[PDB]
């Protein structure tokens, strides 16, 4: 069970995205090669105090 986040600030926050650098970490190779790369989890900030 997960809770959908809410925007609390004017600025946008960090998000995980596919870019030209990491494009081919998420698709197979010509001979079927596959990999799964590590992804971060706590991208958005929250105020401690």
């Amino acid at each position, epitope marked *: 069970k997960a809770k959908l986040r809410a925007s609390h600030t004017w600025n946008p926050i960090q998000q995980m995205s596919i870019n*030209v*650098d990491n494009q081919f970490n998420y698709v197979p190779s010509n001979i079927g090669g596959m990999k799964i790369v590590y992804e971060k989890s706590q991208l958005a900030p929250r105020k401690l105090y």
Partner: antibody
Amino acid sequence: EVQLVESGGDLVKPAGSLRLSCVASGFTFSSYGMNWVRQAPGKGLQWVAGVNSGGFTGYADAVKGRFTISRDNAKNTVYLQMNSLTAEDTAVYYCAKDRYYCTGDYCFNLIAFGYWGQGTLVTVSS
Amino acid sequence: SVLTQPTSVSGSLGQRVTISCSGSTNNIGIVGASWYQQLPGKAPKLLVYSDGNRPSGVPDRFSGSNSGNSATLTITGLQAEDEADYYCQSVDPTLGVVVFGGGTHLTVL
């Protein structure tokens, strides 16, 4: 306008190693490949290595087993790592940009350097 | 794979100059040559693309063509600005190796 600046030249022993760096600006760095072309004193241009957006690299047969090239698109920088240098490697190395937009594994089918840097000198001797 | 160029070519002011680069079906027969200009001690400059186009600001004096395994660069209305060294560049698609020519020195009379 597109501008490139190199660095890293030095004098090393006949069996040492060295690393060079270029800094680029003025264009979509991730869309175009960057290449290392060298010129021995009094001789013609010679290609060394090239790297594309996703980290894919190509090396000439003269350096394929020794050298290594890399990028950092977040810093618009390209590096070349040379190992097991020999005297013949002595040359001024030029950093250039491709005219054509290629990103992934299937580049090096059409290359044309359209902008150039200033060059850095590599000397291999005792 | 390596490309072949003549060591030097000579022409007089106002005439036409031709520089020839020879390759193979593997390099020039698929991707035509691209021509570069190098003043003594300076960084090279691109003159004519593989398709005959020129970078912005290059005079129409410079032109190129491809036939079979050989390419040529034609300089028309030779001026004093053209005394330099010229190179042909092509890429081998079979091997993925970029090939330059040996270079040719241009003498203006």
